[PDB]
């Protein structure tokens, strides 16, 4: 529909199943609904691991870099998937979250060590 503003954004459309998510990485308007109209579907992300224990992430890089060079904004999970794939640099939020997880482990090991004695 006609909008007053908005911008092209590569995001994840949560079109899936109950207790079973499945994201469609699409490039849509920022004023459009999540599962609504889009311009062109890029890829697909399966959050749940399959029988082989792999989270299937599918990226159409040839259209992703085209829309990025045309001016498409990116979301935080999209940049996270690109950083995990290696098409984009690793996100500072992923780096700091891994550091925080390491600090939580470093606190829990000392707590479990001081609990036994």
């Amino acid at each position: 529909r006609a909008y007053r503003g908005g911008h092209l954004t590569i995001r994840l459309a949560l079109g899936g199943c109950t207790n079973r998510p499945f994201y469609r990485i699409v490039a849509a308007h920022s004023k459009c609904p999540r599962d609504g109209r889009f311009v062109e579907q890029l890829g697909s992300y399966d959050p749940l691991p399959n029988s082989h224990g792999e989270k299937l992430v599918a990226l159409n890089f040839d259209r992703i870099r085209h829309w990025i060079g045309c001016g498409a904004h990116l979301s935080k999970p999209v940049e996270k998937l690109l950083g995990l794939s290696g098409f984009y640099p690793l996100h500072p939020m992923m780096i700091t979250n891994a550091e925080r997880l390491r600090r939580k482990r470093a606190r829990e090991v000392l707590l479990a060590s001081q609990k036994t004695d």
């Binding site: 290696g86 098409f87 984009y88």
Partner: peptide
């Protein structure tokens, strides 16, 4: 470059 884009 990032690894995948450099390999590209």
């Amino acid at each position: 470059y990032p690894p995948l884009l450099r390999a590209m």
